Design an enzyme around this catalytic site. Structure first.
Site, mmCIF file in Angstrom:
data_model
loop_
_atom_site.group_PDB
_atom_site.id
_atom_site.type_symbol
_atom_site.label_atom_id
_atom_site.label_comp_id
_atom_site.label_asym_id
_atom_site.label_seq_id
_atom_site.Cartn_x
_atom_site.Cartn_y
_atom_site.Cartn_z
ATOM 1 C CB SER A 260 -1.023 0.033 1.139
ATOM 2 O OG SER A 260 -2.149 -0.773 0.834
ATOM 3 C CD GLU B 216 -4.300 -2.637 -3.168
ATOM 4 O OE1 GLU B 216 -3.481 -1.761 -2.814
ATOM 5 O OE2 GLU B 216 -4.279 -3.804 -2.730
HETATM 6 O O1 LIG Z 1 -4.842 -3.913 6.694
HETATM 7 C C1 LIG Z 1 -4.869 -4.649 5.643
HETATM 8 C C2 LIG Z 1 -4.994 -6.123 5.682
HETATM 9 C C3 LIG Z 1 -5.113 -7.061 6.702
HETATM 10 C C4 LIG Z 1 -5.215 -8.404 6.324
HETATM 11 C C5 LIG Z 1 -5.195 -8.772 4.971
HETATM 12 C C6 LIG Z 1 -5.077 -7.809 3.961
HETATM 13 C C7 LIG Z 1 -4.975 -6.476 4.346
HETATM 14 C C8 LIG Z 1 -4.848 -5.280 3.641
HETATM 15 O O2 LIG Z 1 -4.793 -5.240 2.355
HETATM 16 N N1 LIG Z 1 -4.782 -4.169 4.401
HETATM 17 C C9 LIG Z 1 -4.640 -2.775 3.983
HETATM 18 C C10 LIG Z 1 -3.255 -2.575 3.388
HETATM 19 C C11 LIG Z 1 -2.293 -2.163 4.472
HETATM 20 N N2 LIG Z 1 -2.012 -0.889 4.790
HETATM 21 N N3 LIG Z 1 -1.094 -0.878 5.841
HETATM 22 N N4 LIG Z 1 -0.802 -2.204 6.153
HETATM 23 N N5 LIG Z 1 -1.582 -2.979 5.285
#
Ligand SMILES: O=C1c2ccccc2C(=O)N1CCc1nnn[nH]1
Length: 262
Positions: A44, A140
């Site tokens: 991200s 995504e």
């Molecule tokens: O927080 C999440 C997460 C948790 C479990 C599976 C997939 C995801 C996910 O895509 N994100 C948001 C992306 C992210 N931003 N900061 N850490 N992860």
């Protein structure tokens, strides 16, 4: 090899994974790099490039950030804390940018990518601002597969630090747009356990986190230390097993090493 690099090496060794760090201290424009030219999956943290690209578009379209985008049930992906509230309705490009940056909303990111003509449109913007390393290949959620050795959706710590500096402190964006990006980053909700956990509490910062498979745990930050010119810091971390746990504490440790070395 510097003392800071050796401390970062010891942190890496104890972590079990692979750590990448790039610091730019704008007080003197000097840099501290650790695996600075190795590729890491961005996850991200790539949302910064997409939001910035839309900000750039808004420089020639005053009303662009107010443009509505339809959110359909089919659009929802794996992490949609804001977009799920607006299904069967619309969100503006400003709302999508804020959701992507401040909540790490993956549906919001997909709408930014679409506004740029696909992943390659985000890469095109990177090239236009002098980043020849960044590549966004997928949307995504698959851009988070983070497979070791896979060049897709990667950059280097050196390149990302340079880019973040140009976007937030330099002239890659118009002044209004730069200020908006900084405002968004400073309002991030996801960052207290990562880079910022390793910094003196008196300092201020904006950041964008990322995480993915292989226990990939990332953060990129612009930092205003007390009584110092701003810093830009990138900390990328990835692990050998697909189902590895997140390690935000490793990013905090890297940041503390960097801060204690100034
Ligand atoms: O927080 C999440 C997460 C948790 C479990 C599976 C997939 C995801 C996910 O895509 N994100 C948001 C992306 C992210 N931003 N900061 N850490 N992860």
């Amino acid at each position: 090899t510097s003392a800071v690099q050796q401390k970062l090496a010891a942190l890496e060794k104890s972590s079990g994974g692979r750590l990448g760090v790039a610091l730019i201290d704008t007080a003197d424009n000097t840099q501290v790099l650790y695996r600075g030219d190795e590729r890491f999956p961005m996850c991200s943290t790539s949302k910064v490039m997409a939001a910035a690209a839309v900000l750039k578009q808004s420089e020639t379209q005053k009303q662009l950030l107010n443009q509505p985008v339809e959110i359909k049930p089919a659009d929802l992906v794996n992490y949609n804390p804001i977009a799920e509230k607006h299904v069967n309705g619309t969100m503006t490009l400003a709302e999508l940018s804020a959701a992507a940056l401040q909540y790490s909303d993956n549906t919001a990111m997909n709408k930014l990518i679409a506004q740029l003509g696909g992943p390659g449109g985000v890469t095109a913007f990177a090239r236009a601002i002098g980043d020849e390393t960044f590549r966004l290949d997928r949307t995504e959620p698959t851009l988070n597969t983070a497979i070791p050795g896979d060049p897709r959706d990667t950059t280097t710590p050196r390149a990302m630090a340079q880019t973040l500096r140009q976007l937030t402190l330099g002239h890659a964006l118009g002044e209004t747009q730069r200020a908006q990006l900084v405002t968004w980053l400073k309002g991030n909700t996801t960052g207290a356990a990562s880079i910022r956990a390793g910094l003196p509490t008196s300092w201020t910062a904006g950041d964008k986190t990322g995480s993915g498979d292989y226990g990939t745990t990332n953060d990129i930050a612009v930092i205003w230390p007390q009584g110092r010119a701003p810093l830009v810091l990138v900390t990328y971390f990835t692990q050998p097993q697909q189902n590895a746990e997140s390690r935000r504490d490793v990013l905090a440790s890297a940041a503390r090493i960097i801060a204690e070395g100034l």
